[PDB]
Amino acid sequence: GITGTWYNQLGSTFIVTAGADGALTGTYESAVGNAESRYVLTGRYDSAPATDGSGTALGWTVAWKNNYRNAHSATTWSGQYVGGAEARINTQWLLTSGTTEANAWKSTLVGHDTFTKVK
Amino acid sequence: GITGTWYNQLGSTFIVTAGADGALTGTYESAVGNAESRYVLTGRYDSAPATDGSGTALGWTVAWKNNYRNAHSATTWSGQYVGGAEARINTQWLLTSGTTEANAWKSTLVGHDTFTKVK
Amino acid sequence: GITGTWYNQLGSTFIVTAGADGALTGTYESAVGNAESRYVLTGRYDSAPATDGSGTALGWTVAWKNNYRNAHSATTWSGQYVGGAEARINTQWLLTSGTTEANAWKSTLVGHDTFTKVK
Amino acid sequence: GITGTWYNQLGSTFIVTAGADGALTGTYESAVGNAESRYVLTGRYDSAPATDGSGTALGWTVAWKNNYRNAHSATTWSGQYVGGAEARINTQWLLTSGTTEANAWKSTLVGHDTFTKVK
Ligand SMILES: O=C(O)CCCC[C@@H]1SC[C@@H]2NC(=O)N[C@@H]21
Ligand SMILES: O=C(O)CCCC[C@@H]1SC[C@@H]2NC(=O)N[C@@H]21
Ligand SMILES: O=C(O)CCCC[C@@H]1SC[C@@H]2NC(=O)N[C@@H]21
Ligand SMILES: O=C(O)CCCC[C@@H]1SC[C@@H]2NC(=O)N[C@@H]21
């Protein structure tokens, strides 16, 4: 029930398939930034989703490289799937770009994203 | 040259193999926290490493679930491999645990790690 | 126009007064967590608010200590006041608790908050 | 014992005076970035420092504005003073710049700093 075609508040598309062991595959099309295509993602999530009423912890990784453009950067999301009547995924994310060792302090960006299934 | 057996400042072990397309596989044994084994990791990195003199951006994901213990949590690293005479990987990371919707604010932890190849 | 009585999505109250030089004073009552009173905050913001159409960058600090309860912790917000028809303040924040040197990795928590003036 | 003249790993200077109530005043000269002077800081820390053996939680705020240059940005540190034979302050920090509402995702930067008293 974690697989599907999620959107978020910036408008970017996140097509995902969960795995039997805990794998996470799919593509990710950022609607904003230095990117124009679907990009490859990979990540993991636990499969024992703590049935007391909590959300399923998950995380994944995208590196901004394909046939069209490269930004030499990588972004990781970590969040929790809150699954109920409103299927929601709240994530918080990092973005690291490849900089020179002088510009090491300003490499990382942080932010948040709210993923909804049927927009 | 990104593959290998890295340690860090907490003492945890990170066995990694890079990929021809940009995949990243291997295991991760946290020496601290609610974990006792090697755990499965998966992530990505770009393969056009920007030969002006910058580091290679990379990121990966571990979900704390195996045959021994489960913490219902997932952690993601994003950083850059600085490769020279001293092979170094500086990463900054998030840790998300599966909480109830009341305790949504205190789910995520942030921190930093400094990975060295030959300790 | 930054001064006033803001609420947020968790329900916590943030009473603030800006300064002529750039100071920021007021109180902060967290509606959730290990706190029960108004707490003291202090922070800063720039006063040249970049009239091209951007938001005003700001930040502040609260330490969870008063006559009622102490948590030995400190939280800092950094965000930007987007001021228009809908007066909004989006912030992203850190929370650090005083831990032993063994438990240094799990001290910091990260999160986000969305402040609205008239709720 | 928190007051004094701290340096860090980037070379920036942090002159600080603690307060009887819990206030924190002083100046901050960033040795790197879009800044050239001492800048004004303000923040807070708790004064009941948990004498079991933990560090003192603290945090502060700087807004990059003075007579010389303005960057329309604000940075906040949150960390813990580990005080022993080696007086250390480990902090983790955010940096928010005033951007247009389109460029809201890439406003914030995250990073870490390690402050030492006698360098
Ligand atoms: O910044 C870059 O170098 C490329 C653009 C990255 C897009 C970011 S990644 C996190 C955030 N969420 C998105 O869907 N897109 C932005
Ligand atoms: O907190 C948990 O629920 C399990 C322990 C997680 C270990 C964390 S993950 C990030 C940091 N780096 C490590 O090598 N271990 C800790
Ligand atoms: O965790 C603690 O030790 C005390 C509770 C802190 C409340 C946090 S601070 C950030 C977030 N925003 C709020 O208005 N409250 C929570
Ligand atoms: O980026 C800017 O707009 C101005 C430069 C800010 C300097 C940053 S703030 C955090 C980090 N620690 C420092 O001592 N300097 C950098």
Numbering used by the authors:
A (entry chain C), B (entry chain D), C (entry chain A), D (entry chain B): 16 to 134
Task: Please give me the paper's original passages concerning this structure.
In this work, we use SPA cryo-EM with VPP and Cs-corrector to determine the structure of SA with a molecular weight of ~52 kDa. Different from hemoglobin that consists mostly of α-helices, SA is constituted by mainly β-strands. Our work demonstrates that the VPP can be used in SPA to resolve SA in both the apo-state and biotin-bound state at near-atomic resolution. The atomic model of SA solved previously by X-ray crystallography (PDB 1MEP28) can fit into the EM densities with a correlation coefficient ~0.74, indicating the structural fidelity of SA in its crystallographic and soluble forms.
In the end, we obtained a reconstruction of apo-SA at 3.3 Å resolution (with D2 symmetry applied during the refinement) from a final dataset composed of ~24,000 particles and a reconstruction of the SA–biotin complex at 3.2 Å resolution (with D2 symmetry applied during the refinement) from a final dataset comprising ~45,000 particles. The density of biotin in the SA–biotin reconstruction can be precisely identified with the unambiguous docking of biotin’s atomic model. Compared with the biotin-bound SA, the density corresponding to loop 46–51 in the EM map of apo-SA was missing, indicating that this lid-like loop is flexible without ligand binding. We performed this 3D skip-alignment classification analysis of the apo-SA and biotin-SA datasets separately, and found a rather small occupancy variance around the biotin-binding pocket among the different classes in each dataset, demonstrating unambiguously the lack of biotin in all the monomers of apo-SA and the full occupancy of biotin in all the monomers of biotin-SA. This result occurs because SA has a very strong binding affinity to biotin and the condition of the biotin-SA specimen allowed the full occupancy of the protein’s ligand-binding sites. We also noticed that the orientation distributions of apo-SA and biotin-SA were slightly different. This difference is probably an effect on the surface property of GWI by 4 mM free biotin molecule in the biotin-SA solution. The 39 kDa trimeric dataset had enough signals to generate a correct 3D reconstruction via a global angular search from scratch. Nevertheless, the successful reconstruction of the trimer dataset indicated the capability of solving an asymmetric protein structure with a molecular weight ~39 kDa at near-atomic resolution by SPA cryo-EM.
